[PDB]
């Protein structure tokens, strides 16, 4: 499919950026996770980034570490995550769905088989957090064979070679890292990224989404103003889950208002 391509074309026409929430699949349970995801979409999410619970998520800070743990406490497995993805795609035919994976979960039962399963359930992209460009060949090849966009990271410390590679190899979107470090709302990115955004555009890279540390509407606007095609927010969203575990109703209300506000910031 072309879900990202269609989204960004539509967004460009409305002169707006994308707001893309992250959550962990099955946090804090399967049923509540599914409801959470419906709420994110109803509140205006342009795409989803969805994490599969992994034992050792080394690119994630405590908030998302704890999301993983909650999912595991509910007994969530990769197989159940694929069941969920099928249910999400069944309700929402057009929304781009990207997975956040760690390598071992993709490699575990065969790389090709993993991407084949993604295609079957209607996933649009896969980002493998601990696979740099240098190791990406079998992952990106398998992705493309199964019509999945391989998501590459453009870090703030990217040289020209890396920009060219990420521009060539990637599809769907380019992930523009706010900062060094791990996921978390407590650390906001301090570097201006305008130079990287322009270079990506020159090399015809997939449109850029900025992620890491995005927790406020202002940062969403700033990414778009800086020339990025939108922004991803994970820890900020997951914090609302964590805060409201005991009140599922107030959880959804707070997620709705937050996503609404974040999305509105992408409109200018």
């Amino acid at each position: 499919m072309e879900r990202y391509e269609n989204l960004f074309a539509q967004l460009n026409d409305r002169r707006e950026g994308a707001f893309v929430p992250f959550v962990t699949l099955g946090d804090p349970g399967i049923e509540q996770s599914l409801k959470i995801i419906d709420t994110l979409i109803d509140a205006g999410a342009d795409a989803l980034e969805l994490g599969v619970p992994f034992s050792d998520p080394l690119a994630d800070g405590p908030t998302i570490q704890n999301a993983n743990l909650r999912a595991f406490a509910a007994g969530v497995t990769p197989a159940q995550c694929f069941e969920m993805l099928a249910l999400i795609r069944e309700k929402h035919p057009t929304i781009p769905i990207g997975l956040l994976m760690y390598a071992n979960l993709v490699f575990n039962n065969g790389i090709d088989a993993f991407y084949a399963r993604c295609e079957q359930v209607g996933v649009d992209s896969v980002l493998v957090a601990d696979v740099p460009v240098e190791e990406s060949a079998p992952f990106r090849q398998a992705a493309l064979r199964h019509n999945i966009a391989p998501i590459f990271i453009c870090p703030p410390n990217a040289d020209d070679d890396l920009l060219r590679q990420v521009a060539s190899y990637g599809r769907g979107y380019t992930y523009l890292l706010s900062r060094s470090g791990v996921t978390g709302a407590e650390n906001r990115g301090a570097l201006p990224l305008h130079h990287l955004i322009e270079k990506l555009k020159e090399y015809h890279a997939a449109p850029a989404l900025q992620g890491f540390g995005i927790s406020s509407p202002e940062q969403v606007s700033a990414a778009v103003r800086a020339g990025a095609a939108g922004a991803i927010s994970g820890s900020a969203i997951v914090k609302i889950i964590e805060k409201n575990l005991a009140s599922p109703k107030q959880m959804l209300a707070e997620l709705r208002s937050f996503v609404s506000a974040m999305k509105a910031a992408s409109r200018a």
């Binding site: 050792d56 080394l58 460009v133 410390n157 060094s180």
Partner: protein, 395 residues
């Protein structure tokens, strides 16, 4: 693009977030440069000899092989400053950190030996050192926590996961991914992403070099086999490296069998795991059917790690090196035996290697064999653990 081959056959590589690749490339370049730099080599040699105490003795142990045709020597890394082989490569990596203009050191530790080595090298060479240590390991290897703090290192308990070595590794890597401009990650074993398995081997290879020279001097020939415990792989690859091309010399690595392989409570991924990707490398892993990384177990905190360095996986695959396991109980017996009959108190890690050597002897007592065990550390850190175990046994 790298200067050196990141793989040993299928195993190894650089499976880290993209953010960390410049750090790995910088480290590789600095290593290649240093290896060609006579001044670096001389400084490194100076520290090994005059600070750390190299070369270490090779001790012939007579009592414990009496009545058999086994001749057993122990390579005495337990006499190195700090009390374990960990000191050798820490001195080299600290010099690389300085070469790269880093002012801070991050290290993981399980046994606390690497933590202590990192702290002492940082004190000597003017680096600010922070150590991640699993809360379980904090308790069972506490003598080491005291030592690290006295030398001015920050020690950070890790309560996540199993609260052991794996979890400390995780935290160290997370930290480095946000501090690499100022901090060098002083990885404590021959594992993780390239170039660490290569660097750690090259900075540990004096173990085997000295062993070879010592055995030749004393026995006029090479050993039949050299035997080392395998936690992540550093002491073993340090012993093995100089013998790899001597095809007559057995290379035997000993993984922890914990409560027994069949219980699933062990640290023996090389022989009982399966290849996966974690901690920056493609390597054998203890993992679930689903591809989640398992928790390991060993009585010995230093071997309690659910993966293994890639050069070991490679040497196994081609049949150049053989890997076995030794249980908690077997290691405890070897510990007791060395204390009582040779007057040497070994680390519980090293006790696994000794236990296998004793088994080689006992199983075939009329087999003529010249064996070297890498006695990777002293067991001061373990005396409280062992006391509590023997007390609960009514010994």
């Amino acid at each position: 693009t790298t200067l050196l081959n990141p793989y040993f056959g299928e195993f190894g590589g650089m499976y880290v977030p993209q953010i960390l690749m410049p750090a790995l490339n910088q480290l590789e370049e600095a290593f290649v440069s240093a290896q060609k730099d006579p001044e670096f080599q001389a400084q490194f040699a100076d520290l090994l000899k005059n600070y750390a105490g190299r070369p270490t003795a090779l001790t012939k142990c007579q009592n414990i092989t009496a009545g058999t045709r086994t001749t057993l020597y122990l390579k005495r890394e337990d006499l190195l400053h700090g009390g374990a082989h960990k000191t050798n490569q820490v001195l080299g990596q600290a010099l690389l950190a300085k070469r790269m203009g880093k002012s801070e050191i991050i290290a993981e530790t399980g046994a606390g030996a690497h933590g202590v080595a990192s702290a002492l090298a940082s004190a000597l060479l003017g680096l600010k050192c922070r150590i991640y240590m699993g809360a379980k390991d904090v308790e069972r290897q506490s003598p080491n926590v005291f030592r690290m703090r006295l030398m001015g290192a920050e020690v950070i308990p890790v309560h996540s996961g199993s609260a052991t070595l794996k979890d400390a590794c995780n935290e160290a890597l997370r930290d480095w991914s946000g501090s690499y401009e100022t901090a060098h990650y002083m990885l404590g074993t021959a594992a993780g992403p390239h170039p660490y398995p290569t660097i750690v081997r090259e900075f540990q290879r004096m173990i085997g070099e000295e062993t070879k020279a010592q055995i030749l001097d004393k026995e006029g020939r090479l050993p039949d086999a050299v035997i080392a415990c395998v936690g992540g792989g550093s002491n073993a690859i340090g012993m093995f490296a100089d013998f790899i091309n001597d095809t007559s010399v057995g290379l035997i690595g000993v993984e922890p069998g914990g409560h027994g392989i069949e219980t699933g409570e062990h640290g023996a991924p090389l022989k009982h795991g399966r290849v996966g990707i974690y901690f920056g490398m493609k390597a054998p892993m203890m993992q679930t059917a689903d591809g989640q990384i398992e928790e390991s177990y060993s009585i010995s905190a230093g071997l309690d790690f659910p993966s293994v360095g890639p050069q070991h996986a490679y040497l196994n695959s081609i049949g150049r090196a053989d890997y076995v396991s030794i249980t908690d109980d077997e290691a405890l017996e070897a510990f007791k035996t060395l204390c009582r009959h040779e007057g040497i108190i070994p680390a519980l890690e090293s006790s696994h290697a000794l236990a296998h050597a004793l088994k080689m002897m006992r199983e075939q007592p009329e087999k003529e064999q010249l064996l070297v065990v890498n006695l990777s550390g002293r067991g001061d850190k373990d005396i409280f653990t062992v006391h509590d175990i023997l007390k609960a046994r009514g010994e």
